[PDB]
Design a binder for this molecule. Structure first.
Ligand SMILES: [Cl-]
Ligand SMILES: [Cl-]
Ligand SMILES: [Cl-]
Ligand SMILES: [Cl-]
Ligand SMILES: [K+]
Ligand SMILES: [Mg+2]
Ligand SMILES: [Mg+2]
Ligand SMILES: [Mg+2]
Ligand SMILES: [Mg+2]
Ligand SMILES: [Mg+2]
Ligand SMILES: [Mg+2]
Ligand SMILES: [Mg+2]
Ligand SMILES: [Mg+2]
Ligand SMILES: [Mg+2]
Ligand SMILES: [Mg+2]
Ligand SMILES: [Mg+2]
Ligand SMILES: [Mg+2]
Ligand SMILES: [Mg+2]
Ligand SMILES: [Mg+2]
Ligand SMILES: [Mg+2]
Ligand SMILES: [Mg+2]
Ligand code: NA
Ligand code: NA
Ligand code: NA
Ligand code: NA
Ligand code: NA
Ligand code: NA
Ligand code: NA
Ligand code: NA
Ligand SMILES: [Sr+2]
Ligand SMILES: [Sr+2]
Ligand SMILES: [Sr+2]
Ligand SMILES: [Sr+2]
Ligand SMILES: [Sr+2]
Ligand SMILES: [Sr+2]
Ligand SMILES: [Sr+2]
Ligand SMILES: [Sr+2]
Ligand SMILES: [Sr+2]
Ligand SMILES: [Sr+2]
Ligand SMILES: [Sr+2]
Ligand SMILES: [Sr+2]
Ligand SMILES: [Sr+2]
Ligand SMILES: [Sr+2]
Ligand SMILES: [Sr+2]
Ligand SMILES: [Sr+2]
Lengths: 56, 92, 194, 237
RNA sequence: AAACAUCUCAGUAUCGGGAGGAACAGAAAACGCAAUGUGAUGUCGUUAGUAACCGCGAGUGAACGCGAUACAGCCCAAACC
RNA sequence: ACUCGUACGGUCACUGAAUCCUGCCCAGUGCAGGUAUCUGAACACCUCGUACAAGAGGACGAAGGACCUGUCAACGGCGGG
RNA sequence: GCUUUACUGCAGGCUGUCGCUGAGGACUCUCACUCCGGGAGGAGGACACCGAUAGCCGGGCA
């Protein structure tokens, strides 16, 4: 069984969903953690300086 | 090679020829308080210590004479260039 | 004449001698059984607390904090490092234990601000410090001429920014002349070389 | 290289844990106040998933229903005793002090009241040899002379299930089923059969440990493989 | 650094914590143009690529002072009550 | 974690059902044990040095090594004349 | 990426020493501290654990 097309058919699991806090479809319904805003992980909002060029 | 323990030659101090005694220069002990000694302790820590992680080099097949020439009358010594000698034994 | 305080002071110059020695031997047994931060009714070293600003008043709190003794609890490099940045055992942190203690105390009492702290001993595996904290919201303090300054907005979370006596000393701000070229006015403004 | 299998173990991930949620009970001796006024009746004999040996369910006078590490020869209806004055009969538990020298015991406590630590496997038994006011000498299954506090409790008799080891597994499938009842990763791939990156013995055209197998006690994890601090090897000499 | 380990890149990127409208510093156990002299602290210009560091290699690199900006000095602990 | 486990256990390795068997080698390397003597760091101690300190030397000496022994179903070896 | 008796280091283990740490070159004790016990109490004990440092080993890792 190939890793390509044939294995794409088994994908019918729901993981990332609309997030209650930020509105993005990044709330992982299995981990109960938003990969976009950190909801479920931290009270503070997920943020990182590498999300932009260093001197900006 | 052989060499006379004492012989007449020029004494740069008396400024005239006089009897001298030849002696192989004996190494003097270190005090461990020279600047280099303190730099080894200041700069050596965790990991490699640069120049202080290097170890003693090799040896030349033959070394040069390392002698002192002491004036028999004023007691002062002077140094001279040395020459490669596999062995140096004094006579008397 | 000598104050009664001078006697507590003089006792603590040699915590390992006299009655104080026996007291510590007894006390630590109980301290080892207490938590990381225990609020206490009265300072153990009265002379020191009063000297640092303590007052027997509403809004003044004292707490004893214990911290594990020793160097840094550092994790070894998982990625490439030149010999120089591979050390793990002899590396120590840049904040002293007294400062780590002041911060834990202040976290326990989120509404209070650290005024100062002092040492109350240690055993072979931990150190204890007592920390004086002030309630900037209590009127008994807002009306005190010696402590109301700590009620200002810019004094909020002062301990976390190094504004403590222990904070300032650890930052190398003691000397006003030689040796403080890279500590004053701040470690950061000097490129972090102090 | 990469961490070896022995190192993956310590992390205690599912692959290496024992099926605890399936285990029955902790067969520790009952805790008696004193006097031995504790007796129960064997209400049933059960299989113990964690030891491949049988265990007995006992109902005690005071109303406690607990599984017990059963010796050989215990059956339903039989009455068991646990205390200093318990009768010297197979299946009863009492401190070594009260036990007559020369009597096989099992589930021997290491420290009085711990519940039992030694001689708990199928068909094994410790052998109480010497008594005293300060030290009871027991000979454990490995044949070692152990000095114990005479206050250490034990059960008279040998453990049930003896001889379980006499019959060969015959099939890999049988080994399999038993392994699924333990905290062990099975089957076993030889170190020599792996790539150099995976084990000290991996690599090389043909298979062979490119090094002596007797490793020092001081060796770090990841390197301590093969024959650990062997005092000797082979069958000769 | 024409490799590279001290050094460099650099206390930079990035990470944890925290305050403000600005922060931090700050009224000498200072300075040491050594003096019959200066007089809290930032910052700007300069001192200066100087002193100092350094496989004394490549490189790293201040301060006092001076000219400016703005200026401001106070409160406890204890003694005695 | 192993482990509601305790030597009929479980960890670490090698060989790879049964059957008939599995010789010689402990010098080197590995492991392990022992060790009169030798060697063997720091702190403390002693001598010199310094009104102190740096430092030089000494006495003591742990593991380790030297040295002895055990061990090949331990790495491996079993040639030329 | 991999190897090793390549160079240089780093974890880790063993070992000594100092602190924890007490009383009367071998010793006793209990009071810190450790372990067992539901508890009383028992076992151990200034050792061990832990912090610091020193020597040895150290492709396990860079
Ligand atoms: Cl010569
Ligand atoms: Cl605070
Ligand atoms: Cl098995
Ligand atoms: Cl001046
Ligand atoms: K580099
Ligand atoms: Mg007043
Ligand atoms: Mg049990
Ligand atoms: Mg399984
Ligand atoms: Mg296999
Ligand atoms: Mg392969
Ligand atoms: Mg490998
Ligand atoms: Mg093979
Ligand atoms: Mg380069
Ligand atoms: Mg600033
Ligand atoms: Mg060069
Ligand atoms: Mg720099
Ligand atoms: Mg200056
Ligand atoms: Mg095979
Ligand atoms: Mg095969
Ligand atoms: Mg416990
Ligand atoms: Mg490598
Ligand atoms: Na230095
Ligand atoms: Na706080
Ligand atoms: Na280059
Ligand atoms: Na290169
Ligand atoms: Na350098
Ligand atoms: Na001038
Ligand atoms: Na051999
Ligand atoms: Na590659
Ligand atoms: Sr397949
Ligand atoms: Sr297909
Ligand atoms: Sr699916
Ligand atoms: Sr969470
Ligand atoms: Sr962020
Ligand atoms: Sr240094
Ligand atoms: Sr070093
Ligand atoms: Sr040569
Ligand atoms: Sr806050
Ligand atoms: Sr148990
Ligand atoms: Sr228990
Ligand atoms: Sr191999
Ligand atoms: Sr043999
Ligand atoms: Sr002014
Ligand atoms: Sr066979
Ligand atoms: Sr050998």
């Amino acid at each position: 069984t190939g890793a390509g097309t044939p294995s794409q058919g088994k994908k019918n699991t729901t993981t990332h969903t609309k997030c209650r806090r930020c509105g993005e479809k990044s709330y992982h319904t299995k981990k109960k953690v938003c990969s976009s805003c950190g909801f479920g992980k931290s009270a503070k909002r997920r943020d990182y300086e590498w999300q932009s060029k260093a001197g900006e | 090679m052989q060499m006379p323990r004492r012989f007449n030659t020029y004494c740069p101090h008396c400024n005239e020829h006089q009897e001298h005694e030849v002696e192989k220069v004996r190494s003097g002990r270190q005090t461990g308080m020279k600047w280099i000694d303190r730099q080894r302790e200041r700069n050596s820590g965790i990991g490699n210590d640069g120049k202080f992680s290097k170890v003693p080099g090799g040896d030349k097949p033959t070394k040069k004479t390392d002698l002192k020439y002491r004036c028999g009358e004023c007691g002062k010594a002077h140094l001279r260039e040395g020459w490669r000698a596999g062995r140096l034994e004094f006579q008397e | 004449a000598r104050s009664a305080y001078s006697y507590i002071r003089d006792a603590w110059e040699n915590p390992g001698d006299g009655q104080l020695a026996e007291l510590q031997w007894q006390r630590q047994q109980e301290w080892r059984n207490e938590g990381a931060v225990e609020r206490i009714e009265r300072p153990t070293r009265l002379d020191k607390a009063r000297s640092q600003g303590y007052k027997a008043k509403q809004g003044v709190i004292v707490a004893r904090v214990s911290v594990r003794k020793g160097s840094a609890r550092k994790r070894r490099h998982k990625a490439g490092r030149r010999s120089k940045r591979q050390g793990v055992t002899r590396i120590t942190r840049r904040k002293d234990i007294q400062r780590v203690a002041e911060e834990r105390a202040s976290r326990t009492f989120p509404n209070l601000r650290v005024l100062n702290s002092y040492s109350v001993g240690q055993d072979g595996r931990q150190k204890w410090h007592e920390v004086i904290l002030i309630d900037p919201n209590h009127p008994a303090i807002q009306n005190d001429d010696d402590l109301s300054w700590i009620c200002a907005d810019d004094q909020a979370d002062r301990v976390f920014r190094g504004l403590t006596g222990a904070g300032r000393r650890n930052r190398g701000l003691s000397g006003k002349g030689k040796g403080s070229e890279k500590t004053r006015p701040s470690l950061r403004s000097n490129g972090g070389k102090a | 290289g990469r961490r070896i299998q022995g190192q993956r173990r310590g992390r205690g991930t599912s692959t290496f844990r024992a099926p605890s949620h399936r285990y029955k009970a902790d067969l520790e001796h009952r805790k008696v106040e004193d006097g031995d006024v504790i007796a129960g009746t064997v209400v049933d004999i059960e299989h113990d998933p964690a030891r491949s040996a049988p265990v007995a369910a006992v109902e005690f006078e005071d109303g406690d229903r607990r599984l017990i590490l059963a010796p050989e020869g215990v059956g339903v209806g039989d009455e068991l005793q646990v205390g200093v004055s318990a009768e010297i009969a197979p299946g009863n538990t009492l401190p070594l002090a009260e036990i007559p020298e020369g009597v096989p015991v099992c589930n021997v406590e290491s420290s009085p009241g711990d519940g039992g630590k030694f001689a708990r496997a199928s068909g094994v038994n410790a052998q109480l040899l010497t008594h005293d006011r300060n030290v009871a000498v027991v000979k454990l299954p490995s044949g070692e002379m152990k000095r114990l506090d005479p206050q250490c409790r034990a059960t008279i008799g040998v453990v049930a299930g003896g001889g379980r080891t006499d019959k060969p597994f015959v099939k890999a499938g049988n080994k399999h089923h038993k392994m699924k009842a333990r905290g062990t990763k099975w089957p076993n791939v030889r170190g020599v059969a792996m790539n150099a990156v995976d084990h000290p013995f991996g690599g090389g055209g043909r298979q062979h440990p490119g090094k002596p197998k007797s490793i020092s006690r001081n060796a770090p994890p990841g390197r301590k493989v093969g024959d650990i601090a062997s005092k000797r090897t082979g069958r000769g000499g």
